[PDB]
Amino acid sequence: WEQYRDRVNMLQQERIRDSPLLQAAKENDLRLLKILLLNQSCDFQQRGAVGETALHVAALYDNLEAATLLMEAAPELAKEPALCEPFVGQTALHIAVMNQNLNLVRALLARGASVSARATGAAFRRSPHNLIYYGEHPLSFAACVGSEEIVRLLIEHGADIRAQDSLGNTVLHILILQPNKTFACQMYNLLLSYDEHQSLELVPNHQGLTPFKLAGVEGNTVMFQHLMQKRKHVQWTCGPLTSTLYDLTEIDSWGEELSFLELVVSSKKREARQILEQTPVKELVSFKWKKYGRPYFCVLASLYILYMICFTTCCIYRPLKLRDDNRTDPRDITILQQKLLQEAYVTHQDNIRLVGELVTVTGAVIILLLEIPDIFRVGASRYFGQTILGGPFHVIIITYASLVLLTMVMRLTNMNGEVVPLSFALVLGWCSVMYFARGFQMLGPFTIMIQKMIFGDLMRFCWLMAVVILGFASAFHITFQTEDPNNLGEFSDYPTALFSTFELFLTIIDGPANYSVDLPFMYCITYAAFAIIATLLMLNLFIAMMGDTHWRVAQERDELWRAQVVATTVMLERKMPRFLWPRSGICGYEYGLGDRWFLRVENHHD
Amino acid sequence: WEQYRDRVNMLQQERIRDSPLLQAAKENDLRLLKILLLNQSCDFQQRGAVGETALHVAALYDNLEAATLLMEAAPELAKEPALCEPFVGQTALHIAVMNQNLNLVRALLARGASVSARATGAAFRRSPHNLIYYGEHPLSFAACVGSEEIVRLLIEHGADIRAQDSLGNTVLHILILQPNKTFACQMYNLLLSYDEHQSLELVPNHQGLTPFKLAGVEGNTVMFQHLMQKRKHVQWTCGPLTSTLYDLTEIDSWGEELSFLELVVSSKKREARQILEQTPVKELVSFKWKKYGRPYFCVLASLYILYMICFTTCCIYRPLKLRDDNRTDPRDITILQQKLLQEAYVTHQDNIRLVGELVTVTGAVIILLLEIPDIFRVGASRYFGQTILGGPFHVIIITYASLVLLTMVMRLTNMNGEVVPLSFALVLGWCSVMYFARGFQMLGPFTIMIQKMIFGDLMRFCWLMAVVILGFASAFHITFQTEDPNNLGEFSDYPTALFSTFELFLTIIDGPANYSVDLPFMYCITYAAFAIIATLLMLNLFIAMMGDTHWRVAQERDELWRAQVVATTVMLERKMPRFLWPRSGICGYEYGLGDRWFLRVENHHD
């Protein structure tokens, strides 16, 4: 990890400090260099802790004249890379390119340094431990460091551009995998200017992503619009408004299994949703949502509401009979019990319940047929953790389907206790109707606001709350176990004391007071303390901290609902059949444009 | 719609691409133009998909020399417009004017192009599908695009300014129907500078609106104050304060049926209320509200409060008698029932109730006589949807009058059940007293703030709330239908379970707890879940989201109450008689100013 890298760095600094030739290369001592290179017994192949040569130290500290004296002493040090674990293929050319001095790169290419040297060390891998990802080839280093003359010299001296490093990235991918600066689009245009004699824009990496798809995934927009200038054609500019034509070949992705918009909306990066407001993409998903997405989403919302009404109606008319066993017991109220399966289906109302229960089971199966495959098609942590694709609603729909299948199992085999899976399933499936609230502007941001407070402030409230419930429940059970439970039974034993002080933490039930008896005085004292520190502060500070959170994350939920309606549109196609979803855009084969689909917009500027 | 316009645009691009003369006119190929126009067999009358000539393509891509070679080949193409549906009357002069090149307009007016060419196509209509509304005549195009030399050349070569297009708009209306730029007032002054030989400022469009009234409706203020510089006269400027005199002929609109201020306050545009703060209008409506509006509004508020007190007093002393039928039933409490009409009016207190009920019916009739006509005079969606004119208060006053007329019907005919219209009417008519709260500064913005939360955050809360009521009501009825209903009857059957968990969603009633019996444990578990996710988050997140909404829309309600007091002042005149409302302003006939009414203000500058 980082301590190993620190140990490697102090070891290589110690190895440069110990060796006099490496010390003279580091400190640019010219007279000591003439003494050392004049002596023929000096080892020209001295290596550091990482196997670095003297040119690596001479280029690391940007010593031009020490490096040129080293090539005069030993040209064959130019071919030699490093040989240890954090720097497996690092040459002096990588360091000379990365330090941005042109004359040293001219010095190494004058003596024939390797231009296709794949620096496959662990320091150059795309890792969170490494600060930057500059690729492995010196062409990728020169493209990422932002020197046009160095990359022009490298292409003039070789540097085959179609070179894939570890993770399969070419130089356009690694230029996209950068913090956005001024010269990144200029370097992209310069590297595609040298593409002239399957192009550079169509080769994928090891994830199967084109540079257009990688720019869609990683969330950069200034590279995305620079890419889309080259894929657009301005039709006319009559007056203030102009009509222009965008190509949706690499945006819609009709024929491919993995599409561009699905890679955008199912991304861990926050900025990828900012691609959904870009100048082809916003009106493409707006057309796809207003004509096709919202009516089909309303149809499936109405069908899910009717199915939930059917399951509720089958729940309420449950087969119950009189209790054959006698009670003969105070504190025991049970007058009805579950029917066995033999007399559960004997009447016409029981037959209506049977066909409704078969409808409920058929609905559970058709839930499980179209939702179990994309547990496995996309990642399961990606499927459940994303609030854009509807993760928590997916896991409670899966839980509801499993619970009603367990209800089927406990109905087919005579097992008492159908109350508890019907209770969990009938809470969860009805609370899963809020998944269909994302298709409406008034209901969507409120629903993801409720999700952001379930996964946010309510967890940190309920931890300290449950601390307060445990302490005051225990104190209330101490103060009331010397007491008659028939006069005040809120704290009769410890589970109902826990549940009771959880009940009056929120002030749902009243304070326990009986004025016909004499309560203990320290019930009054620790209940006054419970009134002060628990239901006066915490129940009001929860409202305050929600009000403080709401204005901060209101812009985030307002920009995330418009990202999750795109995920709803992307989900709705490829699952509904293709005859219900015609291909979006204008077909260019009818107008002789060469089998491409286009989208046309008017924009009114000035 | 937009797909038809896209199909038309790709069709005309295909037609320009296929035809070689149109292709050479588009790409300015001069040598191919000399080849084509040198050949006499080439069709000079070639038309595109929209019937566009070669001059339309030559002016669309701003090709001057291609256009002049086309007039050298064919002058008669200058007279020819288009002939299809989206461009019915578009000539090359409209495109040449809209592209803002003067020499091409000089070229077409050198060969005698039609200056009064009415471009009556669907692309030039004022529609939400079209991005801009530049009118139909080339004079309107030159006025809206902002070229003084082009509109001067058009007036020098004809261009009768009193020309009305579809919707009846002249060039001043279409200049007003613009986003506000710098040169709009300059173009207005230039076009009224050419009005010298019923003027341009007095001609109406097809809605009956003058350009002053259209500027009042559409919400532009920089055009409005530029209009009011020409209708004002500065009396004196002694010292820092100056006294000036504004003319209220076109502002007050005494003689006309539709007035200016009513068109301002009953407008769909948001910016029209910003005309109510302008330098004649604010002090005009302030004088009209402070001297006449507020005392008459307080008189009608006191009369409505006394009428509501009379209806309440007639409600409370309702004729009730002892029940002739015996109860003989547990769970049935009814000891009084409605009297029949024969013994309802027999005593002196019944006679006082009879004259009070006649006062109530007379009040309902005089509500319906002055409120049913302006359901139809203005639009009904305009009357009910506007929060400025008092829409929801109008619909609940109409509902209260209909319900008390239904009470009169169900009293005159012996029909049991006067409870249902008296309950709805006595809620609604008392809640309609807040319509008179708009006349006070302390109560007005609060009243429209309550309206903004009725139509705002409470709908989106109550949808997901009713989802929670349905799910937890159904789960509570599962957990308590195996139970004795005499021990805990909140969830005895499904309607009272729905009403009960709606009652303790809000924590009005206590939690159902009986410590002398053993409640089910899954009642405790799903009630702990109902305590966590429904009355701890939602009832606190609702206060949080009102606190987030309030500071955002506080400026909007503060600027909208001062717009709705103007609508109250406009409503109060024309309904109260003319002897109670003298004409506002200073009469110029007494001082010999020529039968106009004026308003005088001092303003203190520097």
What are the tokens at A13?
């600094």
Nearest Cα residue to A263 out of A210, A312, A309, A306: A210
Q: Do B466 and B493 have their domain in common?
A: yes
What residues contact residue B446 under an 8 Å CB cut-off, 6+ apart?
A: B437
Q: What are phi and psi of A600, to 5 degrees?
A: -115, 130
Shortest CA gap A602–chain B (Å): 8
Amino acid present at A598: F
Return the half-sphere exposure (C-beta side, CA atoms, 13 A cut-off) of residue A573: 25
Query: B229 with B222: CB under 8 angstroms?
Result: no
Cα separation of B65 and B28, whole Å?
Answer: 8
What are the tokens at B462?
């109550």
Domain encompassing residue B409 = 279-583
Query: B308 with B433: CB under 8 angstroms?
Result: yes
Sheet with strand B586-587: strands edge to edge:
B232-236, B241-247, B597-604, B586-587
The DSSP bridge pattern shows strands B586-587 and B597-604 to be antiparallel
- First-to-last alpha carbon distance for chain A, in angstroms, is 55
Testing the interface with A: which of B460, B510, B516 to mutate, by most A Cβ within 10 A? Answer: B460
Interchain contact, A502 vs B10, CB within 8 Å: no
Cα separation of B322 and B357, whole Å?
Answer: 23
**For residue A527, what are the CA distances in angstroms to A520, A524, A533, B480, B515?**
11, 5, 10, 31, 20
Cα separation of B54 and B37, whole Å?
Answer: 12
For A473-541, strand residue ranges (E) read none
Cα separation of B594 and B587, whole Å?
Answer: 9
Q: Do B576 and B588 have their domain in common?
A: no
Nearest to B482 among A235, A336, A506 (CB): A336
Q: How many CB atoms lie within 10 A of CB A555?
A: 9
Residues facing B597 on adjacent strands: B587
Nearest Cα residue to A118 out of A77, A159, A147: A159
Task: Give the number of residues written for chain B.
Answer: 606
What are the tokens at A78?
């130019």
Which H/E stretch holds residue A241? strand A241-247
A595 is in an annotated binding site: no
Nearest Cα residue to B172 out of B548, B180, B163: B163
Chain A residues close to B61, C-beta within 8 Å: 236
Nearest to A443 among B9, B463, B541 (CB): B463
Chain A residues close to B520, C-beta within 8 Å: 419
Interchain contact, A550 vs B538, CB within 8 Å: no
In this structure, what is the dihedral angle of CA atoms A384, A390, A395, A396, given to the nearest 10 degrees?
Answer: 160
Q: Do B301 and B430 have their domain in common?
A: yes
Cα separation of B69 and B597, whole Å?
Answer: 61
Cα separation of A84 and B353, whole Å?
Answer: 106
What residues contact residue B436 under an 8 Å CB cut-off, 6+ apart?
A: B297, B300, B301, B304, B305
CB neighbour burial string for B172-206, b if at least 16 within 10 angstroms, e if fewer: bbbbbbbeeeeebbebbeebeeeeeeeebbebbbe
Query: B57 with B22: CB under 8 angstroms?
Result: yes
What are the tokens at B393?
């208060």
Q: What are phi and psi of A82, to 5 degrees?
A: -75, 175
Chain A residues close to B547, C-beta within 8 Å: 547, 550
Q: Do A369 and A352 have their domain in common?
A: yes
**For B538, nearest residue in chain A (alpha carbons):** A450
Nearest to B484 among A241, A335, A507 (CB): A335
Chain A residues close to B532, C-beta within 8 Å: 458, 462
**For A428, nearest residue in chain B (alpha carbons):** B471
Interchain contact, A506 vs B145, CB within 8 Å: no
**For A485, nearest residue in chain B (alpha carbons):** B515
Shortest CA gap B482–chain A (Å): 5
Interchain contact, A431 vs B538, CB within 8 Å: no
The DSSP bridge pattern shows strands B241-247 and A336-338 to be unpaired
Query: B368 with B545: CB under 8 angstroms?
Result: no
Cα separation of A372 and B435, whole Å?
Answer: 56
Sheet with strand A586-587: strands edge to edge:
A232-236, A241-247, A597-604, A586-587
What are the tokens at A367?
């839930």
Nearest to A426 among B7, B474, B517 (CB): B474
Chain A residues close to B533, C-beta within 8 Å: 431, 454
Nearest to B487 among A238, A333, A509 (CB): A333
What are the tokens at B290?
């402070």
What residues contact residue A3 under an 8 Å CB cut-off, 6+ apart?
A: none
Interchain contact, B522 vs A423, CB within 8 Å: yes
Give the 3-state DSSP-derived string for B107-145, with helices as H, strands as E and coil as C: HHHHCCCCCCCCCCCCCCCCCCCCCCCCCCCHHHHHHHH
Q: Do B233 and B298 have their domain in common?
A: no
What is the helix, strand, coil percentage profile of chain B, to 5? 55, 5, 40
Query: How many independent structural domains does chain B possess?
Result: 2
Return the half-sphere exposure (C-beta side, CA atoms, 13 A cut-off) of residue B228: 24
- Experimental technique, in short, is cryo-EM
Residues facing B336 on adjacent strands: B322
DSSP A494: H
DSSP A582: P
Interchain contact, B507 vs A503, CB within 8 Å: no
Chain B residues close to A241, C-beta within 8 Å: 131-132
Task: Give the number of residues written for chain A.
Answer: 606
What are the tokens at B22?
């149109």
What are the tokens at B470?
């349905």
Interchain contact, B507 vs A502, CB within 8 Å: no
Q: Do B131 and B162 have their domain in common?
A: yes
Query: A585 with A283: CB under 8 angstroms?
Result: no
What are the tokens at A56?
């690596």
Interchain contact, A447 vs B468, CB within 8 Å: no
Q: How many CB atoms lie within 10 A of CB B103?
A: 11
Interchain contact, A508 vs B510, CB within 8 Å: yes
**For B516, nearest residue in chain A (alpha carbons):** A331
Binding residues of B for Ca(2+): 510
DSSP B588: T
Cα separation of B8 and B122, whole Å?
Answer: 12
Give the 3-state DSSP-derived string for B187-239, with helices as H, strands as E and coil as C: HHHHHHHCCCCCCCCCCCCCCCCCHHHHHHHHCCCHHHHHHHHCCEEEEECCC
Q: How many CB atoms lie within 10 A of CB B471?
A: 24
What are the tokens at A403?
């619970």
Nearest Cα residue to A211 out of A269, A263, A254: A263
Q: Do B233 and B287 have their domain in common?
A: no
For B508-606, strand residue ranges (E) read 586-587, 597-604
Give the 3-state DSSP-derived string for B420-432, with helices as H, strands as E and coil as C: HHHHHHHHHHHHH
Give the three-class secondary structure for A235: strand
Return the half-sphere exposure (C-beta side, CA atoms, 13 A cut-off) of residue A387: 21
Q: Give resolution, Å, one decimal.
A: 3.2
CB neighbour burial string for B518-550, b if at least 16 within 10 angstroms, e if fewer: ebbebbbbbbebbbbbbbbbbbbbbbbbbbbbe
Residue the block writes with tokens 């578009």: B90
What residues contact residue B198 under an 8 Å CB cut-off, 6+ apart?
A: none
Cα separation of B63 and B268, whole Å?
Answer: 42
**For A459, nearest residue in chain B (alpha carbons):** B532
**For residue B403, what are the CA distances in angstroms to B93, B353, B396, B420, B590?**
63, 19, 10, 9, 53
Residue the block writes with tokens 């291609």: B66
Shortest CA gap A500–chain B (Å): 9
**For residue B575, what are the CA distances in angstroms to B43, B262, B359, B367?**
69, 13, 22, 12
Q: Let me know how many helices (H) and strands (E) chain B has, helices first.
A: 27, 6
DSSP A336: E
Nearest to B475 among A243, A426, A547 (CB): A426
What are the tokens at B341?
């009409």
Query: A82 with A56: CB under 8 angstroms?
Result: yes
Cα separation of A604 and B509, whole Å?
Answer: 59
Cα separation of B573 and B584, whole Å?
Answer: 11
The DSSP bridge pattern shows strands A241-247 and A232-236 to be antiparallel
After which residues, if any, is chain B broken (C to N > 2.5 Å)?
Answer: 197
Give the three-class secondary structure for A123: coil
**For B58, nearest residue in chain A (alpha carbons):** A238
Interchain contact, B95 vs A450, CB within 8 Å: no
Q: What is the DSSP string of A41-104?
A: TS-TT---TT---HHHHHHHTT-HHHHHHHHHH-GGGTT----SSSSSS--HHHHHHHTT-HHH
Q: How many CB atoms lie within 10 A of CB B255?
A: 7
Query: A93 with A114: CB under 8 angstroms?
Result: yes
Query: A261 with A566: CB under 8 angstroms?
Result: yes
Which H/E stretch holds residue A604? strand A597-604
Amino acid present at A368: L
Residue the block writes with tokens 């946010």: A456
Nearest Cα residue to B267 out of B205, B221, B218, B220: B218
Amino acid present at A42: C
Q: How many CB atoms lie within 10 A of CB B395?
A: 17
What residues contact residue A294 under an 8 Å CB cut-off, 6+ apart?
A: A439
- First-to-last alpha carbon distance for chain B, in angstroms, is 55
Cα separation of A122 and A94, whole Å?
Answer: 14
CB neighbour burial string for B18-48, b if at least 16 within 10 angstroms, e if fewer: ebebbebbbebbeeebeebbeeeeeebebbb
Interchain contact, A423 vs B483, CB within 8 Å: no
Cα separation of A171 and A194, whole Å?
Answer: 12
Query: B54 with B92: CB under 8 angstroms?
Result: no
What are the tokens at A511?
């304070």
Chain A residues close to B17, C-beta within 8 Å: 592
**For B548, nearest residue in chain A (alpha carbons):** A551
In this structure, what is the dihedral angle of CA atoms A587, A589, A595, A600, given to the nearest 10 degrees?
Answer: -30
- Residue A575 buriedness (CB in 10 A; 0-12 / 13-18 / 19+): exposed
CB neighbour burial string for A563-574, b if at least 16 within 10 angstroms, e if fewer: bbbbbbbbbbbe
Cα separation of B272 and B2, whole Å?
Answer: 30
Residues facing B587 on adjacent strands: B597
Shortest CA gap A565–chain B (Å): 18
What are the tokens at B288?
């009209």
**For B536, nearest residue in chain A (alpha carbons):** A506
Q: Do B465 and B604 have their domain in common?
A: no
Q: State the Rg of chain B over Cα.
A: 35
What are the tokens at A67?
């490096």
Give the three-class secondary structure for B349: helix
DSSP B66: H
Q: Do B257 and B367 have their domain in common?
A: no
Chain B residues close to A585, C-beta within 8 Å: none
Chain B residues close to A503, C-beta within 8 Å: 511, 513, 531
Q: How many CB atoms lie within 10 A of CB A580?
A: 10
Interchain contact, A431 vs B471, CB within 8 Å: yes
Interchain contact, A238 vs B99, CB within 8 Å: yes
Interchain contact, A443 vs B461, CB within 8 Å: no
Q: Do B303 and B452 have their domain in common?
A: yes
Interchain contact, A592 vs B14, CB within 8 Å: yes
Q: Give helix A348-369 / helix A391-412 axis angle, nearest 10°.
A: 140
Residue the block writes with tokens 């350009």: B211
Interchain contact, A437 vs B61, CB within 8 Å: no
Amino acid present at B376: F
Query: B80 with B111: CB under 8 angstroms?
Result: no
Cα separation of A407 and A412, whole Å?
Answer: 9
Residues facing B576 on adjacent strands: B573
Vertex A98: Cα angle to A97 and A102 (nearest 5):
40
Give the 3-state DSSP-derived string for A252-320, with helices as H, strands as E and coil as C: HCCCCCCCHHHHHHCCCCCHHHHHHHCCCHHHHHHHHHHHHHHHHHHHHHHHHHHHHHHHHHHHHCCCE
Nearest Cα residue to A87 out of A95, A99, A79: A95
Chain A residues close to B471, C-beta within 8 Å: 426-427, 429-431
Query: A266 with A389: CB under 8 angstroms?
Result: yes
Residues facing A601 on adjacent strands: A244
Query: A221 with A184: CB under 8 angstroms?
Result: no
Nearest to A543 among B464, B544, B551 (CB): B544
Cα separation of B411 and B413, whole Å?
Answer: 5
DSSP B582: P
Interchain contact, B547 vs A547, CB within 8 Å: yes
What are the tokens at A7?
């140990």
Nearest to B531 among A461, A506, A598 (CB): A506
Cα separation of A85 and A115, whole Å?
Answer: 21
Q: Do B430 and B455 have their domain in common?
A: yes
Q: What is the DSSP string of A358-409?
A: HHHHHHHHHHHHTTSHHHHSS-HHHHHH-TTTTHHHHHHHHHHHHHHHHHHH
Interchain contact, A437 vs B464, CB within 8 Å: yes
Interchain contact, A506 vs B535, CB within 8 Å: yes
What are the tokens at B583?
């004409």
Testing the interface with A: which of B130, B545, B552 to mutate, by most A Cβ within 10 A? Answer: B545
Cα separation of B118 and B116, whole Å?
Answer: 6
**For B101, nearest residue in chain A (alpha carbons):** A239
Nearest Cα residue to A144 out of A166, A169, A108: A169
Q: Do A505 and A488 have their domain in common?
A: yes
Amino acid present at B64: L
Nearest to B510 among A510, A586, A591 (CB): A510
Interchain contact, A334 vs B482, CB within 8 Å: yes
